[PDB]
Amino acid sequence: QAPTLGAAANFALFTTAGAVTNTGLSHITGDVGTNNAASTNFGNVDGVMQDSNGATSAAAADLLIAYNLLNAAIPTATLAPLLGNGTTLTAGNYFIGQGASLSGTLTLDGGGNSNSVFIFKIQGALSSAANTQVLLTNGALACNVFWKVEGLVDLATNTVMKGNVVANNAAIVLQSGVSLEGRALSTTGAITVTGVTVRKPILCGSAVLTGPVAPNLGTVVCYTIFSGNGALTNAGITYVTGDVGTNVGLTTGFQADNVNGTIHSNPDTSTAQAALDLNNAYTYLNTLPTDIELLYPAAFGQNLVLTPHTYLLNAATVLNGKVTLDAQGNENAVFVIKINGALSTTVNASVELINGAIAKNVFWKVDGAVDLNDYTKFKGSVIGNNGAVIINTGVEIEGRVLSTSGGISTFGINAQMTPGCEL
């Protein structure tokens, strides 16, 4: 059996004792923390910032247990300290009785068995040369790779690294552009990262993320652009699949032959029922418990990747460029993004879906105005509350844009509802 990390598994970056510091734009999936200080200068992290609390205390204890199992592992072979340079290794417990250095390419080959475990016992420091790459093949999984390092871990610029890097009574330093599918864990010592990507490995018994239970949209699943209260006005050449309308005021500017659906030119029984159902959905989304707070709403996007959870952005939010929603292979995964303020975007902003994520299962609860800037590619169901909506030239929506209250103005857009309507 590979060693369990217990609570330490929750983390991308963790030290039992010391400072945890970021510089520049880093992309992190997993908790970040220290059991005796507070991490500084991180941007948006897909994980909880855990500082000197019950979570870090638990991680500290389980990291110790993990370390001891690593230290107890009976070596299957000895390696020279120069690791990589085109070398391939199969499963084993590898003993290096001095400081080690990674260089060039190192391939870990699973032999067609995803249960293959690779443990490196480094009796000294571990360094890499710039542009070093650790590669996995033939079934090998990052969650089954471990480095037990008795000294400073220092990974050079653009190092591609795999596995759980456990530094015992030493610091970890991850230089510009390091990309780690794995974890940086210290039993005490500082962690310093600069412009890195670190994503905790999935599998090896990690719970499959589902996200929260999706709201029931009721009849508003059949609408694509809808206001509970306020004029709905389109200009330019716009195409819609699904219904459009307002429950208070007039809908104008949509050309019937461009709408695969019904334009409700003024309020009717359908808009009345949609308005009730929109309020119910908003209230449901608003009251879902927050899993992860994204601490920098002004900096949202910039190639942030999210996983199935309920997120809170606790201020007006700007989507700059791209945000990606990663279902991690679970097509039924739900993402809820609660925004406590207005939502606006840059031109060419985008929401992208990977690893099975579908727009039907993405929801945005926006407590304020919604403004989708020119040529934004937006996905999911946006439910705004008390604020005007503007959807600018060329915006593409796979999903819907709804407001409980507020006028809506659209300009030359293409908006197509996601599945659920049965009319």
Residue numbers in the entry: 23 to 445
Extract from the study:
Antifreeze proteins (AFPs) are a class of IBPs that have been documented in a number of cold-tolerant fish, insect, bacterial, fungal, and plant species, and this phenotype permits them to prevent and/or control ice crystal formation. Previously we examined the expression, ice binding affinity, and effect on cell viability during freeze-thaw cycling of a bacterial protein. This 54 kDa AFP (IBPv) was secreted by a bacterium within the family Flavobacteriaceae (strain 3519–10) that was isolated from a depth of ~3.5 km in the Vostok Ice Core. Based on the recombinant IBPv exhibiting TH of 2.2°C at a concentration of 53μM, it is categorized as a hyperactive AFP. According to primary sequence, IBPv was predicted to consist of two separate ice binding domains.
Each domain contains a six-loop right-handed β-helix (solenoid) with a triangular cross section, and an α-helix, which runs parallel on one side of the β-helix. However, no electron density was observed for the last 88 amino acids of the C-terminus. Each domain contains one intra-domain disulfide bond, namely C165-C226 in domain A and C244-C443 in domain B. Sometimes the ice binding regions also consist of well aligned side chains and even well aligned water molecules. In the IBPv structure, one flat plane was observed on the same surface for each domain as shown in Fig 1B and Fig 2, and they were not at the protein-protein contacts in the crystal. Site-directed mutagenesis confirmed that the proposed ice binding site for each domain is located at the same region on the β-helix for IBPv. Each domain of IBPv has two rows of water molecules on the IBS that form hydrogen bonds with the protein backbone, and more water molecules are found in the IBS of domain B compared to domain A. In the crystal structure of IBPv, a layer of ordered water molecules forms a water network that consists of several pentagonal and hexagonal ring on the IBS of domain B. However, no such water network is observed on the IBS of domain A, which is the weaker one in ice binding activity of the two domains, suggesting that the presence of water network is correlated with the ice binding activity and thus supporting the anchored clathrate water binding mechanism. Close molecular comparison of the two domains revealed that the bulky side chain of Leu 174 on the IBS of domain A may account for its inferior antifreeze activity.
